[PDB]
Structures are given as structure tokens and as C-alpha cells.
Amino acid sequence: GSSGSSGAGDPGLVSAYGPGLEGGTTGVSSEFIVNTLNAGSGALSVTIDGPSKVQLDCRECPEGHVVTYTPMAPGNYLIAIKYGGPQHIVGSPFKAKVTGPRLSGSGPSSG
Template sequence: MSAYVTSPSGHLENCEIVDLDDCNYSIKFIPKEMGVHTVSVKHKDMHIPGSPFEFTVGPIQGGGAHKVRATGNGLIRGEVNMTNEFNIYTREAGAGGLAIAIEGPAKAEIDFFDRKDGSCGVSFVCPEPGEYQVSIKFNDEHIPDSPFNVVIGSPFGDAKKLTIQSLQNKGHEVNRPCMFTVNVNGARGRLDARV
């Protein structure tokens, strides 16, 4: 397990990890500047659920929807009939109401839990694949980047059906097209490829 804190100025510092008992840990560090800090906690080089975590050192000033942040894979992509998650950080925003709506090809089942520390977690399950819009509002005003366009695809189990042919491992040239074939072999869902 590893943990580090990123200060508002971008400085990275390792955190102290204390093994409490039976898979429980305490993460300790001393903030050295005011503002929003981010703590990343990883197990086997993968972020644990909810990581990275944001918190504020110092007084909160000038709240509002523009101070709310939302992060997590559930705001980018997800799987059909699986729990997709993201986090919302409201501590900087001051007092107000939070509203979450998910619209798309089918009604999503949404679950919300307040962590009582200025952040909350949201999980949702979509019964059909497609593009969904996740709207997050604070005091009836969209937060930055809301609404989020989220592609919900078939479970990765279907992705195992895909095969690639004609992909050369070497011999490619700069600024020249590289091509290969993807056989879906009956897999359902939207195909997305990135380099």
C-alpha cells in the first residue's frame, strides 16, 4: 500500500501509513500550506475506491457550485448491470443542496452516501448500454464539467470475445497510418479504441 498527498502548489509528499489491525490503516501527514490538497491511496499501484480524496486546509471562502468537484471512473465510463462509482467534494462550496440526475437509454438506479466530511459517494447501475448524462447541481446550478457524458458498455466479460488480427508488432513508421482488424465475435456494445 502507498499513500501520498499533493499540495495546492503541486508538491508531492509521501504519507505515513500505520497498520492498525485486520486490514485497517491510518494515513498520516502534516499539511504545509493552505488550500485544497489531494490524498492518493493505492494498493498494488491501483487507487482504492474513492481515491484520490480532496480536503481543504484553512478557511473556506467564496462558496457556490463553482467550488464543487466530482471525480471518478463513473463519470467517464461504466458497465451495464454493474455498480459504477464517483465522488463529489462539496466542502469548499459552503451550505446548499446537492442534486444528482442520470438520464439515458434506461432509468439508472442511484445510491448516494454522505461521508460527513465534505464529500459524498455516488454509485449507480444502468440496465442498458448507451450514452448517459450525469448532471450534478449545487443550489440548482451545474457544477464544473456537468453534465458529464458517460458511456455505459457491456460488461468486460463480452470484451474477452474480441480478437485482433493483422497488427504488426514492429516496423511502423512515424506519421504513417497503422491498421489492424478487430473481430467482435458476437460481442455486444460500443467499440472504443485509443492510442
């Protein structure tokens, strides 16, 4: 098809704020909001990487994009955030340092 940028955006005007990006405590649901409004529109790519996979949940927020995750071990989780571009956004990636004893919850045993 005709030449044209496949959905162009401004990542420089996109930033994320929250205790999840900076870190917190183990077994403590950590989340963060991604202000993409200033940008305008585009796709978002969020991911995490640490000593132990983390269950993250991306939800729609009135401030952009929100993600909630739970740490299963004390360490540094690499939170990558991209928007309208193959590169990272201003400030990313974000290293989240979670402290506290290893806490992993599978499910209920007795009933």
C-alpha cells in the same frame, strides 16, 4: 421576510470524480464522489438519464456526496450535478458512457 439570498454557495469550487461520471461497464456498480468541501455548504441535486432508468443511491461521504448506480444497458447516461445554484457545477453535466451487453437483474427465481 427581509431581503437575502436563499442559501448562497460556490458551485465553481465543487467538482465530482469517479468512473461513474466518465462511464465504465454494464452490470458494474458505478459510483462517484462529489467534492463539495472546497465550497463550504449547500444543497446538491443529482440525476441520471439514459436508454434505461438506473437505480442510483445517494450516500453521505467524508469527501462530500457519493452516488452509486448500476447500468442496465450500454449507452450514454447524462449525470447532472448542481450545488448552491439553479445552474450546473464546473464540469457538469457529466456524460457517462457505459459499454458491454445489456444486463438487467430483477431478482431470484428458484430457492
